[PDB]
């Protein structure tokens with residue numbers, strides 16, 4: 001199988017891959033990533049990242065109940081939350097141009113744009129068209145080339 | 154520093170305190186901390202910590218399904234797990250001198266020796282006397298005076 005350290009650094013790479021199919025209407029100088037809820041694989045994310053075009057991705061944790069997530073965060077990496085916590089977060093986001101990714105696949109039904117599946121030999125992910133449409137950001141459909149090619153043994 | 158980063162530090166300071174009331178059958182040169190499962194506040198632990206007596210605490214994440222948890226870890230900081238993962242974890246711990254703490258602990262009825270409660274103006278924690286009794290490590294009784 002695959003160690004926690006192995007998967008962490010993979011997740012950060014898959015996320016860099018997703019970020020590249022996403023456009024914000026008002027592109028920031030520093031992309032702000034916010035890790036919300038308990039997470040297993042965001043340890044690599046939280047070191048900061050760098051996009052291929054040179055833009056820095058600043059990452060930090062925020063409280064679920066933070067009323068201004070959607071404002072403080074450009075991208076949001078969602079960890080293990082409960083029904084109440086989730087509704088909080090996705091209400092905090094509603095209206096704003098924000099990309100949401102989840103560490104576990106269960107959250108796609110309930111508000112997340114991309115959901116990861118870190119188990120297995122590779123990291124695959126899934127998307128939700130409803131959540132993406134209402135997101136406020138633009139996503140090129142080629143982003144699934146990455147989800148399909150990661151699922152291909 | 155956000156509220157998570159400050160609580161992350163408080164979680165550090167609290168775990169260090171709790172450590173100072175625990176003893177290992179054979180005390181190790183470096184204390185092995187294992188962060189296991191989804192966590193919010195383990196970011197301070199993971200940066201490394203040093204005890205009052207100067208000992209390095211080395212912290213690293215390990216898988217829930219890791220079968221060698223009992224021998225790889227001196228202390229386990231347990232994040233979110235379900236009943237199967239919990240049971241699995243403690244099967245891997247039984248028979249080894251391992252101090253166990255968990256980031257969430259409304260109940261503290263079954264599982265870890267101590268359970269944190271990071272919510273609120275300050276960090277509190279409760280003790281599970283049964284887990285403490287049969288764990289392998291000695292716990293100076295005075296620590297319960299630091300509990301809720």
Ligand SMILES: Nc1nc2c(ncn2[C@@H]2O[C@H](COP(=O)(O)O)[C@@H](O)[C@H]2O)c(=O)[nH]1
Nearest residue numbers: 173174175176177178180290291292293294
């Ligand atoms: N403060 C302190 N307590 C110790 C030390 N070594 C052992 N102890 C405590 O003494 C206990 C032994 O208890 P006893 O043998 O009296 O029944 C150990 O489990 C531990 O709690 C030490 O170096 N310092």
